[PDB]
Amino acid sequence: GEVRQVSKHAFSLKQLDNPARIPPCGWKCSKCDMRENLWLNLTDGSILCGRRYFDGSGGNNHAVEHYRETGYPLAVKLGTITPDGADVYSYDEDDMVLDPSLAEHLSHFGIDMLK
Ligand SMILES: O=C(O)Cn1cnc2ccccc2c1=O
Numbered sequence: 264g265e266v267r268q269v270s271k272h273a274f275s276l277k278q279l280d281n282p283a284r285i286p287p288c289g290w291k292c293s294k295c296d297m298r299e300n301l302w303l304n305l306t307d308g309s310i311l312c313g314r315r316y317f318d319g320s321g322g323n324n325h326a327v328e329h330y331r332e333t334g335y336p337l338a339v340k341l342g343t344i345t346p347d348g349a350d351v352y353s354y355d356e357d358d359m360v361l362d363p364s365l366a367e368h369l370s371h372f373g374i375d376m377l378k
């Protein structure tokens with residue numbers, strides 16, 4: 264249904280050591296020129312573009328391809344982070360999800376969502 268459910272990955276999510284400081288703006292896909300529709304993988308801090316949909320809309324699928332290679336399931340859409348939350352997608356559950364540990368997961372990358 265329409266309500267975002269808690270991801271089964273949220274509580275125990277692996278976040279790798281020595282993460283990048285993710286800035287508040289100005290990101291690019293590390294695999295192509297895209298500067299919109301960018302997804303920050305919460306395990307490794309990769310910044311990669313959103314899915315190509317079957318109507319031909321969306322990005323160049325770099326975030327989904329990175330999931331296929333790593334299994335790192337949660338990503339947050341850059342530009343959606345506010346004091347009230349963010350757009351979090353689970354590749355494993357194939358749904359938009361709630362991450363009750365979002366503030367801690369973003370703090371890992373030096374992101375203050377409350378700012
Ligand atoms: O685009 C991405 O790489 C992550 N993402 C984000 N939002 C979605 C919403 C519906 C269906 C698929 C997706 C999806 O794959």
Ligand SMILES: [Zn+2]
Pocket residue numbers: 292293294295296297311312322323324325
């Ligand atoms: Zn890309």
